[PDB]
Design a protein that fits this description.
This is part of a larger assembly, with one copy of chain A and two copies of chain B. By secondary structure, chain A is α+β, with helices and mostly antiparallel strands. Chain A is 14% helix and 28% strand. Chain A has helices at 59-69, 126-141, 201-206, 233-237, 258-268, and strands at 41-43, 51-55, 76-80, 84-88, 101-110, 112-113, 149-158, 161-165, 179-183, 186-193, 216-219, 229-230, 246-250, 275-280, 296-303, 306-309, 322-324, 330-335. In chain A, strands 5, 7, 10, 11, 12, 13 and 16 form a seven-stranded antiparallel β-sheet that branches. In chain A, strand 1 (41-43) and strand 2 (51-55) form a beta hairpin. Chain A is globular, with a radius of gyration of 20 Å. In chain B, strands 2, 3, 4, 7, 9, 10 and 11 form a seven-stranded antiparallel β-sheet that branches. A three-stranded mixed β-sheet of chain B has the order 5-6-12, with no helix packed on it. A two-stranded antiparallel sheet of chain B has the order 1-8. In chain B, helix 1 packs parallel to helix 7 (300-306) and helix 2 (125-136) packs across helix 4 (186-198). Chain B has eight helices and 16 strands. The longest helix of chain B is centred in the middle third of the chain and has 17 residues, at 105-121. Chain B is globular, with a radius of gyration of 24 Å. Helix content of chain B is 25%, strand content 23%. By secondary structure, chain B is an alpha+beta fold. Classes of the chains: A alpha+beta, B alpha+beta. Chains B and C meet through strand 5 of B and strand 6, strand 10, strand 12, strand 13 and strand 14 of C.
C-alpha cells in the first residue's frame, strides 16, 4: 500500500500530481518486490551509477482525466480492462511535413505499446526512447569503453496508433484479457558521441538493440550502408534518405490544468503528449531485491507535451537534442535549451 | 526447485508481414482493405435452441427468415494484378545463453551449463533446421498458402557474401527435409544460424520476401484484432495508405511451431509452456502427465548427469521453450 | 450432444464478379454506373391509407398528385457495345474433412468417421454435380441472365492440361443435367472436384468467364449495399475507375443453391441450417419439423449405424446425409452459447 503524496514541486510545463488536488482516493509506504509482478526499471542517477524505480499510476490523475475527457470525442480514447477508462488521444492523425555525429536512419518498431502514460495514448514514451539509447550505450561499451553519447535527437517519419490486443500465454486457460493500444512508429535518431573517430559498422549494427517499448525495432539491410559517422550535423541532416518527418521538442508554455491542456490541444490537434519523465514519490532507498541491487523508489509518470519542429536554416540544434538532467527530485529527459 | 524470480529474453525476434500487390507493369503498391456490410441468415443455434434440446416458442418460422446485418472487413487481390509480395525480417540472436534475470546463482550456473552441454553434445543443427523449415515453406503465411497457385520465397541473410537464396514452387518441390537439404545454400544458412546461436552476442538477420500467386480477385486473410463488426483486421500505415498486416506475435508463433515431441504426436504445435492447440482445443503436455515445461525444468540437475530418444526429445523441447523465453517463475 | 466449441471452416471460396464491357474492336473497358435521380408518384400505401380506414383528413386528391423525388444508381450497357463479360474464381479447398475447432474428441471423431463413411458409401458425384451445374449454367449471374439473348460460359480449371472447357448458348443447349453430362469434359471437371474433396490436401481452382449478349441499352443489375438513396450498388476500383460487382457472398449463395431435399421439394434453396426461403419470408426446415441441421447432426450415430449395416441405405436418409454434407461444406458455427 502506498499513500505518500508528491515530494517536491515540478516546473510549470511538466505534469504531476502536485499540480492537482489529490483528494480523490478510494502516508505510509510498505510494498513487496520479490514475489510481486509490478514493473521495475533502471535509469542513471549519476555519471557512474544508476537508479531503480517502479513507476506506479496515480489514480488521482486518471480520475481527473476520465471526468474531464467526456464530451471531447475528438481527443478521447477509451480502453476496457478485465472498467472503462478514457484518456487523451493525440490529435487526429500524424502528418508528414563537438563533432562525431552518428546516425541510425529509418528504425521501424512493430508492435510498440502506445499506453506510455496511464492517461494518454500515442507516441511511445521518451523515457523508453532514452532507455533504448542507454541500452545501445551499454551494448557498444563492451567493445569500446570510451564511447559515450552526450545527447540524442528523435525524428519521427510514420506514426500509427490503433486498438489491438495481447493474447496472453496459457497459465487451465488464458488469464483475464487486457486491451491496450499499440504503435508502429517509424523514426530516425541522431547521436552526439565523444568517440570523435570512425567506428566499424559491423560491431555498431551487432550492438544495436532490437526491443523498443515492448516492440521489435529492426533496420532494413539495404540501409546499413547509411549508418555512418559524420563530423557535422549540418551535413548529417542533408544525408538521411527520407525527406519527410518531424522533430520532437518540448512545449515550454504552461500546461497547469487539463482544461488548459485541451485548450492548447484544440488550436492545432497535431502535437502529441506522452510520458517524458518520472517523479519519485519516495527518496532512493535500498531494498533486498532490486533490479540490480541499486536503490529503489516508487515513482509516478509525468505527462509532457511534444512539439513539432521542422529543421531548416536558422534552426539551432539546441532546441531538438534531449538528455537526462538528473534532478534531485525528479528524473526526466528534456531538451537542453531550458535553463 | 524453481528460483523465486527468473526470466528470459527471446532469442528469435521476427518483424511483421506487409502485403504488397505487384501490377503487371512491375509497379508495387500496398494492399488496401475496405469495410463491407453483408446480410446474413439467422443460423446460430441459440436463436432457435436457447433451451437445452427443445425449440424456443418465440422463434416462429417467419421470425427465422429475416436477415440479420453483419459488418466485416474485406480484403482481396485487385483485378488485373499479377502477384502479391509479402515481406518481413526475422532475427536470430543468442539471449538463451545468458538468463535475462535470476535470483539464484545455483539455477544460473545449472542453466548455463545445461545450454552449453546441449550445444556441445546434441548440437544446434536440429533446432536450426526445424526453424528454417517453417520460414522456407511459407508457414508464416498461414491460410494464404492454401488456395494459392504457386508461391516462392527469397531470403537475403545479413552476413552473406553471394547471391540471394530462393525457393521456387514450394507446393510441389521443397516439401521435405531432404528436398530442403538439396538446395545449394541450405547448409550455409544452417551453419549461419548455428554460429549465431553459439557465438556470444551474435546476430543473424534474414530479409524474407515471398511472392504469392492467387486467382482473379482471390481472398486474402490477414490477422484480426483481439478486442456489429464481426471481423476487424490489424492494419499499419504504409506510404500513407492503410494496409492489412499479418502481425508480429502471429509470425513469431508461425516460425516457432516445431513441437513434434509431445506424447502420441500427430502434428507440431506451437512451442510453449504447455501443448496448447487452437484447432481441436485441448491441453497437451498437461502438468498432470508431467510432460509440461515446469516438470522437465525441475530435472535439470539429473539430466546433466545423463548427458534414449526421449532424452534428446526432452532437450529439444526444453531448448525450444528456452529460446522463446518467458517469466518462468 | 452439441459441443460448446464446435466450428467448421468454409470449403468453397467464390470471388467478386467483375463486370466488363467489350466493344467491336475487342477492346475491354470497365463498366461504370451513375447515381441519376428520378421523380415518382405518391403511390405507397402509408401515404394514403392507415392501419385501419383511410386518412381523409390530409390525403386529399391534390396532395396525392405531388411528385416525390427519389435517387437511384443506374447501370446500363453503353450504346455500340458488343456484349458484357464477367469473370471470377472459385476454390474447392477440402476443408470439410476435419473440424476447424472442436472441444470434445468424441464428437470430432464421430464427424470424421461420418465424413469417411459418406465418402465410401455415397460418391461425391451428387454434391459435385449440383455444385458445378450452378457454376456452369449461369446461376451466379442472378437476374442478369434474364432478358438476355444468350450467355456463354468459358472456364479454365486447375490443375489442367489440354483443352479449355467452354459452354456455349446455355439457354438452349444446356438445360438439364443430362445435357450437361453430354459434354466431353464434364466427366473430367466433375472428377476433379470429388478428387479434391476426397483428400486431405485437395484443391481445385476454377476461373470462370461468362459473356452476356444483352439488348441495346439494357440495364445490368449488380448487388446492392446494405446501408439518401433507395438503391446503391457495391463497387470496386478497376483500372482507376468505379465498377459494380456482384459480391463474393452473393455468388457464394448462387453456387450453393442446391437444397431440394425438403418436405415440400419444389424449388432449390440456399443451403442453410433452417432452409430459409427469401422469396416467401419463411423457412421450410424449421426445427419443429424435425429436419433442421441440428436435428440431423444429433442423429450422427444413427446415420453411422445405417451406413455400416446395409449396402443400400434408405433414400430419405440419403437426402438427409446430402443436406448434412452440404452444410458441412458450407461451414459455420455450430456451438451453443
Amino acid at each position: 500500500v502506498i499513500r505518500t503524496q508528491a515530494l517536491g514541486e515540478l516546473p510549470s510545463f511538466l505534469l504531476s500530481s502536485s499540480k492537482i488536488p489529490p483528494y480523490h482516493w478510494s502516508t505510509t509506504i510498505n510494498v513487496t518486490l520479490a514475489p510481486n509482478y509490478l514493473t521495475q526499471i533502471s535509469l542513471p542517477d549519476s555519471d557512474t551509477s544508476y537508479i531503480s524505480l517502479s513507476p506506479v499510476a496515480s489514480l488521482s490523475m486518471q480520475s481527473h482525466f476520465h471526468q474531464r475527457l467526456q464530451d471531447e470525442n475528438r481527443h478521447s480514447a477509451i480502453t476496457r480492462f478485465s472498467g472503462a477508462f478514457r484518456m487523451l488521444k493525440s490529435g487526429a492523425k500524424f502528418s508528414s511535413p563537438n563533432g562525431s555525429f552518428l546516425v541510425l536512419p529509418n528504425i521501424r518498431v512493430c508492435g510498440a505499446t502506445a499506453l506510455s502514460s496511464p492517461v494518454t495514448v500515442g507516441i511511445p514514451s521518451l523515457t523508453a526512447f532514452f532507455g533504448f539509447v542507454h541500452a545501445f550505450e551499454r551494448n557498444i561499451n563492451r567493445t569500446t569503453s570510451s564511447f559515450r553519447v552526450e545527447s540524442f535527437a528523435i525524428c519521427v517519419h510514420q506514426l500509427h496508433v490503433e486498438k489491438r490486443g495481447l493474447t496472453a500465454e496459457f497459465v487451465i486457460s488464458a488469464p483475464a484479457t487486457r486491451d491496450d493500444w499499440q504503435c508502429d512508429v517509424v523514426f530516425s535518431l541522431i547521436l552526439n558521441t565523444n568517440f570523435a573517430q570512425h567506428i566499424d559498422q559491423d560491431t555498431l549494427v551487432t550492438s544495436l538493440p532490437k526491443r523498443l517499448a515492448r516492440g521489435s525495432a529492426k533496420i532494413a539491410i539495404d540501409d546499413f550502408k547509411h549508418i555512418n559517422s559524420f563530423s557535422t550535423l549540418e551535413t548529417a541532416i542533408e544525408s538521411l534518405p527520407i525527406e519527410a518527418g518531424r522533430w520532437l521538442s518540448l512545449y515550454a508554455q504552461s500546461n497547469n490544468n487539463l482544461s488548459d491542456l485541451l485548450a492548447a490541444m484544440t488550436e492545432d490537434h497535431q502535437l502529441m503528449a506522452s510520458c517524458v519523465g518520472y517523479h519519485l514519490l519516495e527518496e532512493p532507498k535500498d531494498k533486498p531485491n532490486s533490479l540490480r541491487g541499486y536503490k529503489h523508489a516508487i515513482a509516478e509518470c509525468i505527462i509532457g507535451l511534444i512539439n513539432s519542429i521542422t529543421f531548416s536554416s536558422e534552426t539551432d540544434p539546441n532546441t531538438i537534442f534531449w538528455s537526462l538532467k538528473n534532478y534531485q527530485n525528479y528524473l526526466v529527459v528534456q531538451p537542453r535549451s531550458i535553463n | 526447485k524453481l528460483p523465486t524470480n527468473l526470466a528470459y529474453e527471446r532469442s528469435i525476434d521476427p518483424s511483421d508481414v506487409c502485403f504488397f500487390v505487384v501490377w503487371p507493369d512491375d509497379r508495387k503498391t500496398p494492399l488496401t482493405y475496405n469495410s463491407r456490410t453483408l446480410l446474413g441468415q439467422m443460423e446460430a443455434a441459440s436463436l432457435a435452441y436457447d433451451v437445452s434440446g427443445q425449440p424456443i416458442k418465440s422463434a416462429t418460422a417467419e421470425a427465422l427468415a429475416q436477415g440479420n446485418p453483419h459488418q466485416v472487413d474485406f480484403c482481396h487481390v485487385p483485378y488485373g494484378a499479377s502477384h502479391i509480395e509479402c515481406s518481413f525480417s526475422v532475427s536470430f540472436s543468442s539471449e538463451l545463453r545468458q538468463p535475462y534475470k535470476c535470483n539464484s546463482s545455483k539455477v544460473k550456473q545449472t542453466l548455463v551449463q545445461l545450454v552449453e552441454l546441449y550445444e556441445t553434445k546434441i548440437g544446434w543443427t536440429e533446432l536450426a533446421t526445424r526453424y528454417l523449415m517453417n520460414i522456407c515453406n511459407g508457414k508464416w503465411l498461414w491460410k494464404n498458402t492454401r488456395k494459392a497457385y504457386c508461391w516462392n520465397i527469397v531470403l537475403t541473410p545479413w552476413p552473406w557474401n553471394g547471391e540471394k537464396v530462393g525457393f521456387e514452387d514450394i507446393r510441389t518441390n521443397y516439401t521435405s527435409r531432404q528436398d530442403f537439404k538439396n538446395n545449394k545454400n541450405w547448409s550455409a544458412i544452417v551453419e549461419m544460424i548455428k554460429t549465431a546461436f553459439s557465438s556470444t552476442d551474435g546476430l543473424a538477420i534474414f530479409e524474407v520476401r515471398a511472392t504469392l500467386h492467387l486467382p482473379t480477385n482471390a481472398m486474402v486473410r490477414p490477422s484480426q484484432v483481439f478486442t456489429q463488426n464481426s471481423r476487424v483486421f490489424q492494419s499499419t500505415t504504409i506510404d500513407g495508405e492503410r494496409s492489412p498486416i499479418l502481425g508480429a506475435f502471429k509470425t513469431g508463433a508461425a516460425i516457432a511451431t516445431i513441437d513434434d515431441w509431445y506424447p502420441e504426436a500427430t502434428e507440431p504445435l506451437r512451442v510453449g509452456r504447455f501443448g496448447v492447440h487452437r484447432e481441436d482445443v485441448t491441453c497437451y503436455r498437461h502438468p498432470s502427465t508431467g510432460k509440461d515445461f515446469f516438470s522437465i525444468l525441475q530435472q535439470a540437475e539429473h539430466y546433466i548427469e545423463v548427458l534414449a530418444q526421449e532424452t534428446i526429445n526432452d532437450m529439444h523441447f526444453l531448448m525450444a521453450n528456452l529460446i522463446k523465453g518467458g517469466m518462468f517463475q
